[PDB]
């Protein structure tokens, strides 16, 4: 169970929500799991989505457990120059499936909210 | 898709502003007082 | 009256155009409104079989269109990229 | 009295015409916590925005049977199941009206000195009016509640009004009845929400969720269609890591307007509406729903707080 | 009937307007090139137009 928290989309004091996950799998496929919004305002028929791929439109924030997901990979490195060091793309990233007694907390989609504000 | 764009950008709640993705309109109002 | 093979051409027409904007407006479409029924939204979400599959679709023909249609690409590594040594070698 | 951007009026009660710069506003009764109706600007063009809460015309004498907001405190009385024991019949203190512009305005209610001591705060923003309550409690031993709103809003025609947004929760079946939950309704609500029609979901406690429903809820099966949706009453929520239910919204397709109802330290959330024996309450439709922390006890302690807060937003100008 | 198909499905998922006007111009220039092409331009200008 790689517990996983998420904190979604800046709201006032936090706006966490709570999951538990058996790791193996990708951020993408673990969050669509626990029906927990990622791409931000994009629909699904075409806009960005579809996985594995090109568009980068989720930009999920770690703040904990961050030592435990799959390396960065050079699509990564090559698609979020504005990064600040903190953040991946997590449709190109994995998570151990033998971390079963993890803990990690997230913070979704940036560039939509206020924070580091806090804490 | 001609009307896939016009439903894309006629209909909808402004994305920029519609409160579930970002705040940007009203936070600094001073919930339940001392 | 007009044309009945000209009708049902027409027919045909203005049935795959009216069929193009209903999915259209069944994917993009607002709720809200009273022509998004909605019932069958909370149906094919519900019993959606070939999820598994279809995405997979998703993944191909997005990764095309943001491809540019790879032509696009195949001008700049064979052209441009063509040229840039000719010059090169006709200098040496 | 006091007032700076409003007036403390009476028509049958006392009561309070909460403004801000805007055109929107609360019509707030002082005689207890029940909203009586809030008027925001949902549209442009039109002068302003009309869509309030259901509010039943009077009855008796000052009327007061029609909801609408109204909190429903109570406490889980350690000698029976019995949680209608009293919202504690008693005063109601208005104090320090504060508005810090004229696009904001907020009242504290008080009452003290028969139960704990209990503060109401009502806030009306350029968009959202919300509620919250303070339970401050100490004595001889920990005391319990419920702490439910029920917020009846009003919808359009009951065959084209339904939810979005939940989609996942546990959704817990079980409806405790005859006020929603939660008794001690705001002088009314509703009453014996039961189902006779036809074969109607859950074993009456079921946690038979597992929602995935989906985007839409078409809530027209009604009259009992009222279920918590919170967490599993300590099944799934008493190890570490209890996966927290949601956070709301509704829709009505025959209008095109959108309310989110947003909580906050509270537990769970009452949807539930009638169109059964809907003839008797009116013409269009309406349903009660707004949060609480009902479906465990709720044991605060000997000198401790307590907190919940539901927010109307609408965001759909 | 290449160009025609070719710009029809290159409008999708291209979230840019003033790009994706441009592919559906092409695409419908498109069905201009093909009408040329059977002799009834009568009704390819007529479509231009
Ligand atoms: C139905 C079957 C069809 C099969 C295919 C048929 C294709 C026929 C047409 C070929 C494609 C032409 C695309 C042109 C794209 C373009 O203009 O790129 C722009 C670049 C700009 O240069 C570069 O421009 C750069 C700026 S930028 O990158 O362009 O922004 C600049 O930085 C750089 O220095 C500079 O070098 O142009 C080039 O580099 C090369 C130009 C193309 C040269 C073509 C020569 C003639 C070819 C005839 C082929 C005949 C085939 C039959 C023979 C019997
Ligand atoms: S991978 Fe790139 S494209 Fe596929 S979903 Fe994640 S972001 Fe959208």
């Not at chain 1, 120059?81 to 190109?92: E, I, V, Y």
């Not at chain 1, 499936?97 to 079963?100: L, R, V």
């Not at chain 4, 169109?275 to 009116?282: E, S």
């Given at each position: 169970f790689a517990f996983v928290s998420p904190r979604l989309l800046?709201?006032?004091?936090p706006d966490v929500h709570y999951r538990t996950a058996c790791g193996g799998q990708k951020l993408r496929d673990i969050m669509l799991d626990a029906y927990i919004d990622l791409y931000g305002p994009y629909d699904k028929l075409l806009l960005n989505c579809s996985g594995g791929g090109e568009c980068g439109t989720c930009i999920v924030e770690v703040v904990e457990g961050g030592e435990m997901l799959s390396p960065k990979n050079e699509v990564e490195k090559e698609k979020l120059?504005?990064?600040?060091?903190?953040?991946?793309?997590?449709?190109?990233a994995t998570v151990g499936?033998?971390?079963?007694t993890g803990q990690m907390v997230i913070q979704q989609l940036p560039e939509w909210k206020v924070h580091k504000w806090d804490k | 898709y001609m009307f896939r764009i016009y439903l894309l950008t006629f209909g909808g709640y402004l994305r920029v502003h519609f409160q579930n993705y970002s705040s940007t309109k009203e936070s600094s109002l001073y919930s339940i007082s001392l | 009256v007009n044309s009945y093979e000209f009708i049902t051409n027409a027919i045909s027409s203005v049935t795959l155009a009216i069929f193009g904007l209903f999915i259209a407006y069944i994917f993009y479409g607002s709720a809200y409104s009273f022509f998004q029924n909605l019932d069958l939204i909370n149906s094919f979400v519900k019993r959606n079989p070939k999820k598994e599959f279809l995405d997979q679709v998703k993944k191909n023909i997005y990764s095309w269109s943001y491809n540019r249609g790879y032509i696009d690409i195949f001008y700049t590594r064979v052209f441009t990229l063509g040229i840039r040594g000719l010059t090169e070698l006709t200098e040496f | 009295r006091k007032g700076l951007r409003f007036g403390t009026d009476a028509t049958g009660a006392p009561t309070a015409e909460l403004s801000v710069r805007n055109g929107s506003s609360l019509q707030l009764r002082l005689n207890d916590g029940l909203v009586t109706s809030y008027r925001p600007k949902v549209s442009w063009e039109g002068g302003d925005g009309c869509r309030e809460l259901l509010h039943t015309v009077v009855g008796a004498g000052a009327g007061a049977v029609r909801g609408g907001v109204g909190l429903v405190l109570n406490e889980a009385a350690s000698?029976?199941?019995?949680?209608?024991?009293?919202?504690?019949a008693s005063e109601w203190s208005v104090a320090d009206v504060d508005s810090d512009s004229y696009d904001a305005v907020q009242v504290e209610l008080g009452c003290v000195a028969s139960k704990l001591e209990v503060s109401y705060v009502v806030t009306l923003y350029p968009l959202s009016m919300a509620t919250a309550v303070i339970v401050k409690n100490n004595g001889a031993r920990p005391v319990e509640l419920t702490a439910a709103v029920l917020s009846h809003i009003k919808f359009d025609k009951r065959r084209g009004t339904a939810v979005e947004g939940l989609r996942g929760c546990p959704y817990c079946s079980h409806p405790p009845p005859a006020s929603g939950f939660a008794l001690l309704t705001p002088a009314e609500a509703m009453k014996r929400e039961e189902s006779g029609w036809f074969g109607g979901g859950g074993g009456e406690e079921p946690r038979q969720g597992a929602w995935t429903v989906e985007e839409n809820l078409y809530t027209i099966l009604k009259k009992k269609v009222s279920r918590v949706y919170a967490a599993p009453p300590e099944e799934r929520k008493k190890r570490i890591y209890n996966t927290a239910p949601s956070k709301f919204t509704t829709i009505d397709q025959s209008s095109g307007l959108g309310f989110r109802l947003v909580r906050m330290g509270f537990e769970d959330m009452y949807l539930g509406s009638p169109?059964?024996?809907?003839?008797?309450?009116?013409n269009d439709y309406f349903l009660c729903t707004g949060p609480a922390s009902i479906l465990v006890p709720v044991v605060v302690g000997p000198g401790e707080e307590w907190r919940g807060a539901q927010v109307i937003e609408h965001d759909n100008l | 009937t290449i160009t025609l198909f070719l710009g029809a499905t290159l409008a999708l998922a291209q979230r840019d307007i003033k790009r994706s006007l441009a592919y559906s111009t092409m695409s419908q220039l498109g069905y201009m090139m093909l009408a040329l092409g059977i002799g009834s331009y009568q009704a390819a200008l007529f479509h231009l137009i």
């Open positions: 800046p709201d006032g004091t120059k504005r990064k600040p060091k903190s953040w991946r793309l997590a449709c190109q499936n033998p971390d079963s | - | - | 000698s029976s199941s019995s949680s209608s024991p009293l919202l504690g169109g059964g024996m809907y003839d008797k309450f009116g | -």
